[PDB]
């Protein structure tokens, strides 16, 4: 329902998916040769099947391939500061793969929007969707677009002719919440005849 979802969300408005009261098998996730790279930071990508969790927060957004490294702790950038942030103690995995076959148009796919101008970096797991005009000068423009006022939102052009280093990609990030409650998200335990 998440990776094969019908609709996608913008990076500046990254949707949050809540996972609870279900059994998830990650063998198909990391055993598939159709996923570009699944960046796993915090515990393990493989020997984690002996660890349970209460709730899992799932987020997904479309970014360019040049920004793959930006989705990580201790990173700075457009998305890494003004749109998303990961703490240095983050637990979870990040997955990205090619999206040219689904999110590219000859005339350019401009449906995806991202924040470009911001006064300060965001907190971890903090989503900013404000459309307030950014003032880059000392003299205020009284909320009027002009020399000292620029739109904080920006879009990227996706075309089939774009190179492998410039094709669009879809990035999915997963995080785990471990409160003082019994676990609700479990993995398939070993079964034998």
């Amino acid at each position: 329902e998440v990776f094969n979802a019908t609709r996608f969300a913008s990076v500046y408005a990254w949707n949050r998916k809540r996972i609870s009261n279900c059994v998830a098998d990650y063998s198909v996730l990391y055993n598939s040769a159709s996923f570009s790279t699944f960046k796993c930071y915090g515990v393990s990508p493989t020997k984690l099947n002996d660890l349970c969790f209460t709730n899992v927060y799932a987020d997904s957004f479309v970014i360019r391939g040049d920004e793959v490294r930006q989705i990580a702790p201790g990173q700075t950038g457009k998305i890494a500061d003004y749109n998303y942030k990961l703490p240095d103690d983050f637990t979870g995995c990040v997955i990205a793969w090619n999206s040219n076959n689904l999110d590219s148009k000859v005339g350019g796919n401009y449906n995806y929007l991202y924040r470009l101008f911001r006064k300060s970096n965001l907190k971890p797991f903090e989503r900013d969707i404000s459309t307030e005009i950014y003032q880059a000068g000392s003299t205020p423009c009284n909320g009027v677009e002009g020399f000292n006022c620029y739109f904080p939102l920006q879009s990227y052009g996706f075309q089939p002719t774009n190179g492998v280093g410039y094709q669009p990609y879809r990035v999915v990030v997963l995080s785990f919440e471990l409160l003082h409650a019994p676990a609700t998200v479990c993995g398939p335990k070993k079964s034998t005849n």
């Epitope: 055993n31 930071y41 915090g42 515990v43 702790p73 103690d89």
Partner: antibody
């Protein structure tokens, strides 16, 4: 900012035993897989070994297979390398490193790889006549 | 175990692009882990490219890696070099037993 500090190398007599360490600062050390790599003057990079984030999985080199010892301790936020049996070639600064990815995969092959973007200050072993 | 070969010295003016034949003569290096590091002499090496075409922070965008799928090799492309780029380039990776380093390079900027 995240940074690593290594110290302990210097004047050491051949054939003896020694202990080295990697100080860490900035990130959750226990959430990462540590490194051990040496760089000889007049030569290039000479990787030594690797270690899983929790110490269960360890990976080593063929040239000094069994000749050193590699270890880490989570609580003290430190990384260690109980190297032994120094020879002529091993004159090399030792660089402790952070992993760019923990255990990433192509899709079919899943191992704890090694990727370095942030390095340490450097400690150099001096074994000479 | 394995061995990569690098031209120990290549000369090229900064206006054009240089390439390196990261040739590991044994086995195969397809669908495995990829690394690349650059060293200013007398200092610690600096990473260039990891896993095909991924570049670190602060490095000029001019660098760009590549892999020859048919010939079982790799290559690095840097467009519009600079005299500041005079350094040592190394080819590291990991086959799933150990890590191998290449012969090294001495790139010369003919400016």
């Amino acid at each position: 900012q995240v940074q690593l500090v290594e110290s302990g190398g210097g004047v050491v007599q051949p054939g003896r035993s020694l202990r080295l360490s990697c100080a860490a600062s900035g990130f959750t050390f226990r959430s990462y897989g540590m490194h051990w790599v040496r760089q000889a003057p007049g030569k290039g990079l000479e990787w030594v070994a690797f270690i899983s984030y929790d110490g269960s999985d360890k990976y080593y080199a063929d040239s000094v297979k069994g000749r050193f010892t590699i270890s880490r301790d989570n609580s003290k936020n430190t990384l260690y390398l109980q190297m032994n049996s120094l020879r002529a070639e091993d004159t090399a600064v030792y660089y402790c490193a952070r992993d760019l990815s923990a255990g990433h995969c192509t899709g079919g092959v899943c191992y704890t790889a090694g990727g370095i973007d942030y390095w340490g200050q450097g400690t150099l072993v001096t074994v000479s006549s | 175990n394995f061995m990569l070969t690098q031209p120990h010295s290549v000369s090229e003016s900064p206006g054009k692009t240089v390439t390196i034949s990261c040739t590991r003569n044994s086995g195969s290096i397809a669908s495995n882990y990829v690394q690349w590091y650059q060293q200013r002499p007398g200092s610690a090496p600096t990473t260039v490219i990891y896993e095909d075409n991924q570049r670190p922070s602060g490095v000029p965008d001019r660098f760009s890696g590549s892999i020859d799928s048919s010939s079982n090799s790799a290559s690095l492309t840097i467009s519009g070099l600079k005299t500041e780029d005079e350094a040592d380039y190394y080819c590291h990776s990991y086959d799933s037993d150990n890590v191998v380093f290449g012969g090294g390079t001495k790139l010369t900027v003919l400016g």
